[PDB]
Nucleic acid binder design. Structure first.
Ligand SMILES: Nc1ncnc2c1ncn2[C@@H]1O[C@H](COP(=O)(O)OP(=O)(O)OP(O)(O)=S)[C@@H](O)[C@H]1O
Ligand SMILES: [Mg+2]
Lengths: 404, 48
DNA sequence: AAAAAAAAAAAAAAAAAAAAAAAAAAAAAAAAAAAAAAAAAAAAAAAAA
DNA sequence: TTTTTTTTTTTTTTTTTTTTTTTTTTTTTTTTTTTTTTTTTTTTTTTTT
């Protein structure tokens, strides 16, 4: 009988070996051939905030040192992002993990979870993270997590850079099981070695994910077969959170459009709550279902966790000029005001261009594209004022949630 | 054409209306004019 | 050590194209009227109760 | 003096041709929004006093 459907299943194969090809050419085509945006003595002022006098003093102190400054084709000064973070390293400006006021802090775990497909969590959240990383005055050690097995956050120009030299790896899955060589114990040095990777920024870091992570849900069903205390919830907490809380301060986490055991652990173990969403009716209805589903499930999780300290909703794909969606936003501000961000993330062709070349808004400048300037200008400025207002929620709660 | 028919073998009742009515009106004026040409050169035919 | 001159830059102004809206025209009907065609009710004629 | 049949009046019904009106689709049409080239403004270095 299933002669032609041996043909047909091994022709889903004889097409996904051609898609194995296709990914080979995708890798060959994405390859970097780019330079990071320069600060032009005014963009430097706007972004870093260093005064011209102190900047001159520091760049001279470094100029007499080993490193040499560089200039554009014109004698006008131009300093690269690498040179930027180097001058920050040598600025002596301490971070939240070096400030005498507060240096022994735990991670500020920030998450982006929506149960609605394709509406913006990936792109908006990676944009938000790369913008928060623009806080060069403070050198945040940031961990981007692409917990969505299909996110491009390991590939999208803030990526998990798995060069050819990269030998082997053990994803969050294998941290949920300790499937590394049984002889070696998973210590934080191992975590730097094969879990924490750079993102072409000397400050921003990441974790990668893989479609094999979907097998985690099957293994969790198997564990429910072998367990009944729902103890897999704490598997994340001890394996990952206790091992990472010692030596980082922020962890960007994308989770995916889905609500699943993996995403249940992401929800629970995390000590902060953010809720991405759009202004559409059905989306907010799904959020209603979400607000019914949670409380009982949190009751299911161990009583040791005293609930998440703050809850806020997000906009996205917000055209800002459609009557229905602004009415929805008004209703949200009417119901959970002070627990929803005011900031708006608009949609424009500039984001499309950014995505198609994979390059985040910061990676490209006006010369790269057309005059979708002010659109990108107000996009990055809303994302940065939104980053400081979410981090100001976190500031006012650096009394509460750090002591629980 | 498609129905393998001719212009005349279907009548107005066959169904258009004014459309086909003017259709055969024009076709039948063209036939008058044509067959008049037919005399005009047919008198030449009888004599060759 | 400072001034002036020279060179690589953003902001404003001008022109054209694609979105949309209203009106008009070709058409394409379902309904009615007029004319035409196919049968019918009082009167008339001849041979005969 | 009566009866029968046929040729004229008129009456009834139907089809075809030709009457009007409405809706749908197609064509010409400026306002608003979007795109590209640009003249003015800002920054740095070298040379001279
Ligand atoms: N500003 C934007 N401009 C253009 N496309 C956008 C924008 N924001 C979101 N998108 C759409 O989002 C797609 C990829 O981004 P995401 O929406 O994050 O996908 P995602 O990971 O499923 O997140 P969700 O489920 O939509 S919230 C793009 O291919 C677009 O279709
Ligand atoms: Mg997604």
């Amino acid at each position: 009988k299933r002669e032609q459907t041996i043909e047909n299943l091994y022709q889903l194969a004889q097409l996904t070996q051609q898609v194995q090809a296709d990914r080979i050419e995708i890798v060959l085509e994405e390859r970097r051939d780019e330079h990071f945006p320069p600060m032009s003595k005014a963009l430097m002022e706007t972004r870093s905030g260093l005064t011209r006098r102190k900047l001159d003093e520091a760049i001279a102190k470094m100029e007499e040192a080993g490193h040499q400054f560089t200039k554009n084709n014109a004698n006008h000064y131009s300093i690269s992002l690498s040179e930027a973070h180097m001058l920050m390293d040598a600025a002596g400006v301490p971070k939240f993990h070096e400030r005498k006021k507060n240096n022994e802090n735990k991670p500020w775990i920030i998450n982006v979870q929506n149960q609605k497909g394709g509406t913006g969590k990936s792109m908006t959240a990676v944009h938000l993270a790369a913008c928060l990383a623009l806080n060069l005055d403070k050198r945040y050690r940031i961990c981007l997590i692409d917990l969505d097995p299909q996110g491009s956050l390991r590939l999208f120009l803030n990526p998990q850079i798995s060069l050819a030299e990269h030998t082997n790896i053990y994803s969050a899955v294998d941290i949920m099981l300790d499937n590394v060589p049984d002889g070696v114990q998973v210590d934080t040095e191992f975590l730097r070695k094969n879990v924490m990777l750079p993102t072409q920024y000397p400050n921003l870091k990441t974790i990668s994910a893989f479609p094999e992570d979907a097998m985690f849900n099957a293994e969790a069903w198997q564990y429910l077969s072998q367990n009944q205390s729902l103890d897999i919830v704490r598997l994340l907490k001890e394996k990952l959170i206790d091992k990472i809380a010692s030596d980082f301060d922020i962890i960007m986490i994308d989770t995916g459009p889905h609500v699943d055991p993996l995403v249940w652990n992401a929800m629970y173990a995390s000590n902060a709550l953010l809720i991405p969403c759009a202004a559409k009716r059905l989306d907010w209805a799904s959020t209603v279902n979400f607000f019914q589903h949670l409380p009982t499930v949190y009751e299911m999780f161990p009583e040791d966790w005293k609930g998440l300290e703050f809850v806020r909703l997000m906009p996205t794909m917000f055209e800002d000029d459609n009557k229905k969606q602004v009415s929805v936003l008004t209703e949200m501000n009417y119901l959970l005001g002070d627990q929803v961000m005011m900031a708006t993330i608009p949609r424009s062709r500039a984001f499309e261009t950014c995505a198609d070349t994979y390059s985040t808004v910061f990676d490209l400048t006006v010369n790269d594209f057309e005059g979708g300037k002010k659109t990108l200008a107000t996009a990055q400025d809303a994302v940065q004022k939104s980053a400081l207002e979410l981090e100001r929620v976190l500031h006012s709660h650096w009394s509460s949630l750090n002591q629980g």
